[PDB]
From a paper:
The Kaposi’s sarcoma associated herpesvirus protein ORF45 binds the extracellular signal-regulated kinase (ERK) and the p90 Ribosomal S6 kinase (RSK). ERK and RSK are key downstream components of the epidermal growth factor (EGF)/Ras/ERK pathway. RSK consists of two kinase domains connected by a flexible linker.
ORF45 makes contacts with the C-lobe of the NTK. The NTK/VF-motif crystal structure showed how the valine and phenylalanine side-chains snugly fit into a small hydrophobic pocket and highlighted the importance of other neighboring D/E residues involved in electrostatic interactions. As expected, binding affinity decreased by ~100-1000-fold when F268 was changed to serine or L285, M287 or R305 were replaced with alanine or with bulkier tryptophan/phenylalanine residues. The VF-motif binding groove by the αG/αH region at the bottom of the NTK C-lobe, to our knowledge, has so far not been reported as a linear motif binding surface.
Author numbering:
A (entry chain B): 23 to 69
B (entry chain A): 45 to 111, 119 to 228, 231 to 348
Write the structure that this text describes.
């Protein structure tokens, strides 16, 4: 068995980024954690 | 550095009969894009009578080519084929393949739970389509999930091949102002390079495997800031091979990005992530898709 993967659901015709500012979206993976805004060339921090 | 703009005015297979509005019958609206509605049409005249096509209506469309018909050369197993192009009353009409499989994101959402190997198949077919346009000097530029469709057999089909389009007045927006898949150089307006497509490729790979976008902001302004300056923590449910590809793809300097080296696309094909893909069999459509649409 591979590493447990998250349940993935999308909203097709994705809603525009500008609108829906405070509307909560259903429960899933929140997103990548922003470690800092250092602007490094390598976007992902090394493990 | 030479860039050439080819205006899309008319198109038909060489030696075939050019089409006009009278030869099509409208059936329904397939979907809504940035440039307008996409229609389903039935050919009522000619050798392809009774065949169904997808139709886009635009003010004009041009293809930017850097460095045989270009509309014929762009033909690829995983790219929509343009069958007719004609102009009437100051409007451009594009007659395309009717993609009956739907979009990939809806199919993935229908499954909810899937493997990395499942997403791998679609990324690999997407990679071949992008390189084919790159081989002819074309940039996809604005790659987004709306452009990623499936055919009846379940194979990837891009809805466009790098066309620069302008919508009709009815569809015209007041403010021209999608940044989520844009590369840092694009945000900086440094120019759109072929390495920018592989950045968009990486964001799609991230979104398909995680279900979330790597850079999330409240508005266009914030997300652009995140693309330029954000440092992210690798999701730990991703496989080591997937993390490696994302790290090589997510480099803010275009030259450091995978696929921008001398070998080009074979850098990505040879990556540990795509090890289980037989690329020649994939191109021959001899590898079954993970999910069939008809279900
Ligand atoms: N050939 C096709 N066959 C079937 N459906 C299609 C086809 N082309 C487009 N669609 C549908 O129409 C939607 C919009 O197509 P798309 O190519 O994204 O439009 P667009 O005018 O290029 N705007 P955009 O993609 O946002 O730049 C797609 O997501 C599909 O649902």
């Amino acid at each position: 068995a591979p590493r447990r993967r998250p349940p993935v659901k999308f909203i097709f015709p994705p809603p525009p980024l500008s609108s829906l500012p405070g509307f909560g979206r259903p429960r899933g993976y929140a997103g990548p954690t922003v470690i800092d805004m250092s602007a490094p060339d390598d976007v992902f921090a090394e493990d | 550095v030479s860039i050439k703009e080819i205006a899309i005015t008319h198109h038909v297979k060489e030696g075939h009969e050019k089409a006009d509005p009278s030869q099509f019958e409208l059936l329904k609206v397939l979907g809504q894009g940035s440039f307008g509605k996409v229609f389903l049409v039935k050919k009522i005249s000619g050798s392809d009578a009774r065949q169904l096509y997808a139709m886009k209506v635009l003010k004009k469309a041009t293809l930017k080519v850097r460095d045989r018909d270009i509309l014929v050369e762009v033909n690829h197993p995983f790219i929509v084929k343009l069958h007719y192009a004609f102009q009437t009353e100051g409007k451009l009409y594009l007659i395309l393949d009717f993609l009956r499989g739907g979009d990939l994101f809806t199919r993935l959402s229908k499954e909810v739970m899937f493997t990395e190997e499942d997403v791998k198949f679609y990324l690999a077919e997407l990679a071949l389509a992008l390189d084919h346009l790159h081989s002819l000097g074309i940039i996809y530029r604005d790659l987004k999930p709306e452009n990623i469709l499936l055919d009846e057999e379940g194979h990837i089909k891009l809805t466009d091949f790098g066309l620069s389009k302008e919508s009709i007045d009815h569809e015209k927006k007041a403010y021209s102002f999608t940044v989520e898949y844009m590369a840092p150089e694009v945000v900086n307006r440094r120019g759109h390079t072929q390495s920018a497509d592989w950045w968009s490729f990486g964001v799609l790979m991230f979104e398909m495997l995680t279900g979330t976008l790597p850079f999330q902001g409240k508005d266009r302004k914030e997300t652009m800031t995140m693309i330029l300056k954000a440092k992210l923590g690798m999701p730990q449910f991703l496989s080591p091979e997937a993390q490696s590809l994302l790290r090589m793809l997510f480099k803010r300097n275009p030259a450091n990005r995978l696929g921008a080296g001398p070998d080009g696309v074979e850098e990505i094909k040879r990556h540990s992530f795509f090890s289980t893909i037989d690329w020649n069999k994939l191109y021959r459509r001899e590898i079954h898709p993970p999910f069939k649409p008809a279900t």
